[PDB]
Amino acid sequence: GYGYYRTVIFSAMFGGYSLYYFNRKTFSFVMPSLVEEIPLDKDDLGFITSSQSAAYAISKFVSGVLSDQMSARWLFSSGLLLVGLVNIFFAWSSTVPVFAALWFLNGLAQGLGWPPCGKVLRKWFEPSQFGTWWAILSTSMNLAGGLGPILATILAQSYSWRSTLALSGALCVVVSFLCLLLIHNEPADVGLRNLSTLQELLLSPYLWVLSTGYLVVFGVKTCCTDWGQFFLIQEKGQSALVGSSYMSALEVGGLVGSIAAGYLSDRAMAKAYGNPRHGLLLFMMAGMTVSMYLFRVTVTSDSPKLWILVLGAVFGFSSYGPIALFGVIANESAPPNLCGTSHAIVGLMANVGGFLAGLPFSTIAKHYSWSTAFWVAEVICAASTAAFFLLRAEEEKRKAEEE
Amino acid sequence: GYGYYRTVIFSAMFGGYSLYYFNRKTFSFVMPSLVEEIPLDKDDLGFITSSQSAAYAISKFVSGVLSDQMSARWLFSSGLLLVGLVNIFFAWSSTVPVFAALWFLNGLAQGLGWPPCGKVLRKWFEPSQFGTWWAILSTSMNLAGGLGPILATILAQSYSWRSTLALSGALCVVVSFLCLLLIHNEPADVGLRNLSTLQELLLSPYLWVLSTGYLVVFGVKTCCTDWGQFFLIQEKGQSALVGSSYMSALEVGGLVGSIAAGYLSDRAMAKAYGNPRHGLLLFMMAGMTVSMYLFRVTVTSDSPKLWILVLGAVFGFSSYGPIALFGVIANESAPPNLCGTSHAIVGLMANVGGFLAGLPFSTIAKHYSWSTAFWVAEVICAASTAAFFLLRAEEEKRKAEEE
Numbered sequence: 084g085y086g087y088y089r090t091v092i093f094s095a096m097f098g099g100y101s102l103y104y105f106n107r108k109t110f111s112f113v114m115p116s117l118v119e120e121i122p123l124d125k126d127d128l129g130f131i132t133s134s135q136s137a138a139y140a141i142s143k144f145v146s147g148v149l150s151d152q153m154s155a156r157w158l159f160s161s162g163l164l165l166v167g168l169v170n171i172f173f174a175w176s177s178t179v180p181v182f183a184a185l186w187f188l189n190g191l192a193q194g195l196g197w198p199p200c201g202k203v204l205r206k207w208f209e210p211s212q213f214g215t216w217w218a219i220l221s222t223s224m225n226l227a228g229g230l231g232p233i234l235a236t237i238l239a240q241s242y243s244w245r246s247t248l249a250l251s252g253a254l255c256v257v258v259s260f261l262c263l264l265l266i267h268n269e270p271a272d273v274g275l276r277n278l279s280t281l282q283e284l285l286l287s288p289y290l291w292v293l294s295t296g297y298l299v300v301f302g303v304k305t306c307c308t309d310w311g312q313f314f315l316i317q318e319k320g321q322s323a324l325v326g327s328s329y330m331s332a333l334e335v336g337g338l339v340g341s342i343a344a345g346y347l348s349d350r351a352m353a354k355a356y357g358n359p360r361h362g363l364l365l366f367m368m369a370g371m372t373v374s375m376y377l378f379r380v381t382v383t384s385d386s387p388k389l390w391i392l393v394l395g396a397v398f399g400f401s402s403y404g405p406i407a408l409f410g411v412i413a414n415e416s417a418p419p420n421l422c423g424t425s426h427a428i429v430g431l432m433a434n435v436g437g438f439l440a441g442l443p444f445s446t447i448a449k450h451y452s453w454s455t456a457f458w459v460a461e462v463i464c465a466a467s468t469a470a471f472f473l474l475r476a477e478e479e480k481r482k483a484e485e486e
Numbered sequence: 487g488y489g490y491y492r493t494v495i496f497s498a499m500f501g502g503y504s505l506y507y508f509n510r511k512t513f514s515f516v517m518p519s520l521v522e523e524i525p526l527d528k529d530d531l532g533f534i535t536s537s538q539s540a541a542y543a544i545s546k547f548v549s550g551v552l553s554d555q556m557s558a559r560w561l562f563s564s565g566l567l568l569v570g571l572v573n574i575f576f577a578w579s580s581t582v583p584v585f586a587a588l589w590f591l592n593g594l595a596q597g598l599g600w601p602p603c604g605k606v607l608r609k610w611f612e613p614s615q616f617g618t619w620w621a622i623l624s625t626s627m628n629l630a631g632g633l634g635p636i637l638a639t640i641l642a643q644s645y646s647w648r649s650t651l652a653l654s655g656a657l658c659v660v661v662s663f664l665c666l667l668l669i670h671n672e673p674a675d676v677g678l679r680n681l682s683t684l685q686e687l688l689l690s691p692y693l694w695v696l697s698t699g700y701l702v703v704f705g706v707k708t709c710c711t712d713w714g715q716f717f718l719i720q721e722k723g724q725s726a727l728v729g730s731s732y733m734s735a736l737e738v739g740g741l742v743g744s745i746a747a748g749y750l751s752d753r754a755m756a757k758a759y760g761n762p763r764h765g766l767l768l769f770m771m772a773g774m775t776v777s778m779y780l781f782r783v784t785v786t787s788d789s790p791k792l793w794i795l796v797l798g799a800v801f802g803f804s805s806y807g808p809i810a811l812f813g814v815i816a817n818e819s820a821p822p823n824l825c826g827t828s829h830a831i832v833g834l835m836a837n838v839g840g841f842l843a844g845l846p847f848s849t850i851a852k853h854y855s856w857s858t859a860f861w862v863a864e865v866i867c868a869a870s871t872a873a874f875f876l877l878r879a880e881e882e883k884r885k886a887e888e889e
C-alpha cells in the first residue's frame with residue numbers, strides 16, 4: 084500500500100536523523116571521559132565545537148544545493164556513512180588537530196543529513212500531513228539530545244570511550260546501509276502514484292520576506308536561549324536553579340511548540356486566502372513578542388517560580404514553533420526541484436541571525452544593561468511582527484482588489 | 487576618443503576604491519585618539535573589526551550577485567555614499583554598540599565597493615590590458631594602506647578625530663557624486679564601440695577548480711601573513727625587528743607580485759593552447775611552494791637578514807600574484823553578465839580559506855610544533871600545485887587528442 088512505504092520511510096528517516104543528531108554531539112556527550120584520558124584545554128574544546136559549527140553552517144547550504152540535484156536516498160545514506168566512518172576514525176585518534184579535522188568532516192556530513200529528509204518528506208507527504216511529520220522528524224533532534232547524556236553515561240559505565248564511539252560509528256554504518264535499503268525517494272520509484280528556474284526562486288520576494296522573518300525569529304531564539312540565564316542571574320537576581328529550570332522549561336515548551344506548530348498548521352491546511360500556514364505563524368510571533376514583554380517587564384526579584392516557568396514555556400511554544408513553520412514554508416513554497424535551495428537559504432539566514440544574536444547582543448548588554456539588550460531584541464521582533472501583519476493585511480487587500 | 491573615457495573612468499575608480507580602502511580601515515587608523523578620548527576594551531575593538539569583517543564577507547558575495555544585475559555606476563556610487571554617510575554618523579556617535587552597528591553598515595558598503603569596479607574593468611578593457619589595470623586598481627588598496635597612518639597622524643595632529651572622520655565622510659560623499667558623474671558602465675553608453683545561465687556557471691568545472699585553487703592560495707597567504715612572525719620569533723629564534731622587517735618585505739614583495747602578475751599576464755595574453763594566464767599562475771604557485779620550503783628548512787637562528795628578506799619578497803611575489811590572477815581569471819572566465827557571481831564565489835572561497843588558515847593552523851602549531859604546521863601548509867600547497875600541473879598537462883593532452 085501507500086501507507087506502508089509512508090511509515091517505513093518515515094521510520095527509516097527518523098532513526099537516521101536521530102543517529103545524525105546523536106553523532107552531531109557525541110564529542111559533547113563523551114567530554115568527561117575524554118578530558119579524563121587526555122587533557123584538553125577549554126579553548127581546544129570550544130575550537131572543536133566551533134569547527135563543527137562552521138562545517139555544519141557551510142554544509143547546510145551546500146547540502147541544500149546538492150540535495151536539489153542528487154537523489155536524496157544516496158545523499159542521506161552517504162552522509163550517515165561518512166558520519167559513522169568519521170566517528171570510528173575519531174575513536175582511532177588520540178590528538179587534538181586530528182580530532183578537529185575529523186570533527187570538521189563530521190560537521191560536513193551532519194549538514195549533509197537533513198535536506199535529503201526534507202526532499203523525501205516533500206515527495207511522500209501531501210501538505211495535509213507534511214507539517215506535522217516535519218515536526219515529528221525534527222523531534223528526533225530533541226530525542227537524541229534527551230537520550231544523549233543518559234546513553235552516554237550508560238555506555239561510559241559499561242565501556243570505554245574508544246569502544247563507545249566505535250559502537251556509535253558501527254551503528255551509524257549499519258543504519259546507513261539500512262537507510263540505503265529502506266528509503267525511497269518518490270512514489271514513482273515504487274510504482275505508486277507520484278503527487279521553475281533558480282533565478283525565479285532568488286528573485287521571488289516571498290523567499291526573501293521569509294528570509295528576514297527567519298532571521299528575526301532565529302535571532303530572538305538565539306538571544307533568549309543563550310542569554311536568558313544571564314538575564315535572570317545578573318539583573319533580576321533570580322537563582323541558578325531558577326535559571327536552569329527556566330531553560331529546561333523553554334526547551335520543553337519549544338518541543339511542544341514544534342509539535343503543535345506542525346499539527347495545528349496541518350489542521351489549518353486541511354481546513355482550508357493565501358497560505359494557510361500564516362495564521363498560526365504570525366500568531367506565534369505575536370506570542371513570542373508578548374512573552375518577551377512579560378519576561379522583560381513583569382519578572383522581578385520577587386516574581387514566583389511558576390510565572391517564570393510559564394513565560395519560559397510560552398516563549399518556547401512561540402519560538403521553536405515559528406522556526407519549524409519557517410522550515411515547512413521554506414520546503415513548501417519552492418518547486419520540488421528547488422526546495423532544498425530554499426531551505427538552504429533559510430539556513431544561511433540561521434547563520435546570519437546567529438551571528439547578530441550571539442556576540443553583538445552581549446556587547447549591547449554589557450555596555451548599556453541587560454534590560455536594554457532584551458528591549459532591543461523585543462523592539463526588533465515587535466517591529467518585524469507588526470510588519471508581517473501589515474504585509475499579510477496588504478495581501479488580503481490585494482486579493483480583494485483583484486476580485 | 488576611447489582612451490579619454492578609458493583613463494577618466496580608471497582614475498575615477500582608482501580614487502573611489504582608494505577612498506573605499508581608506509574608509510575600510512579608518513577606525514584602525516584613528517584608534518589612538520579614539521581610545522584616548524573614550525576607553526574601549528580590546529575585546530570591543532576586536533569585535534568592531536570582526537563585525538566589519540563579517541559584513542564585508544557577506545557583502546562580497548551579495549555585491550557580486552547584485553553587481554551582475556544592477557548597473558555598476560550607481561552601485562559603486564551608492565556604496566561609496568553609504569561609506570561617507572556611515573563615517574559621518576560614526577563621527578556623530580560616542581558609544582560602542584552604535585560604533586559596531588555603523589561599522590557593520592560600513593562593512594556592507596565596503597563589500598559593495600569592488601564588484602562594480604570589476605564589471606567596469608571588464609567592460610572597458612580588452613584582455614590585452616585587463617590584468618595589468620586590475621593590478622593597478624587593486625594597488626589602490628595598498629596605496630590607501632600605505633597612506634593610512636601618515637595622513638591619519640597628520641589629520642590627528644591638525645584636527646580632532648571627530649573632525650577627521652567628518653572630513654573623510656564628506657570627502658567620500660563628494661567623491662561618490664563625482665564617481666556617479668564620471669564613471670560610465672560600457673562604451674555603448676557613450677557612443678563608442680562596445681567590445682549563459684547561472685546553472686551553467688555553477689556546473690562549470692573551471693570555476694570550481696579555480697575555487698579550490700584560490701582556497702589553497704589564500705589559505706597559504708593567510709597562514710604566512712598571520713603566522714610568519716610567530717614562526718620566526720618562537721621556533722627559529724629570530725628577533726622582532728627581523729620579523730617586522732620580514733612582514734614589511736612580504737608586503738612589498740606582494741605589491742610587486744600583484745603588479746608583475748597583472749603585467750606579465752597581459753604580456754602572455756597579447757603574445758598568444760588554452761588560457762594564457764595559467765603559465766604565469768602555476769609558475770607563481772610553484773614559486774610559493776619553493777619559497778615555503780626554503781623558509782621552513784633553510785632559515786635557522788644563524789640565517790642572515792638578507793636571505794630571510796629575500797624569502798619574504800619571493801613569497802610575496804608568489805602569493806599576492808596568484809590572488810590577483812585568480813581575481814582576473816574569475817572576472818574573465820565568466821560571461822559579462824555573470825562575472826560578478828564568479829568573483830563572488832571566489833570571495834566565498836577567500837572566507838573559507840581564511841577560516842581554515844586562521845584558527846586551526848594555530849591549533850596544529852600549538853599541539854605539534856610551528857614547523858609541523860607550516861609543513862602541513864606546504865604539503866597542502868605542494869599537493870595542490872602538483873595537481874594543477876597534472877590538470878593542465880592533461881588538458882594539453884586533450885587538446886592534442888582532439889586534433
Ligand SMILES: O=P(O)(O)OC[C@H]1O[C@H](O)[C@H](O)[C@@H](O)[C@@H]1O
Nearest residue numbers: 107139143197221224410430433
Ligand atoms: O544542531 P543545531 O545547530 O541546533 O541545528 C539543527 C537544525 O539544523 C537545520 O537547520 C535543520 O533544518 C533543522 O531541522 C535542525 O533542527
Ligand SMILES: O=P(O)(O)OC[C@H]1O[C@H](O)[C@H](O)[C@@H](O)[C@@H]1O
Nearest residue numbers: 510546600624627813829833836
Ligand atoms: O581588506 P581585505 O580584507 O584584505 O580584502 C581586500 C580584497 O577584497 C576582495 O577580495 C577584492 O576582490 C580584492 O580586490 C581586495 O583586495
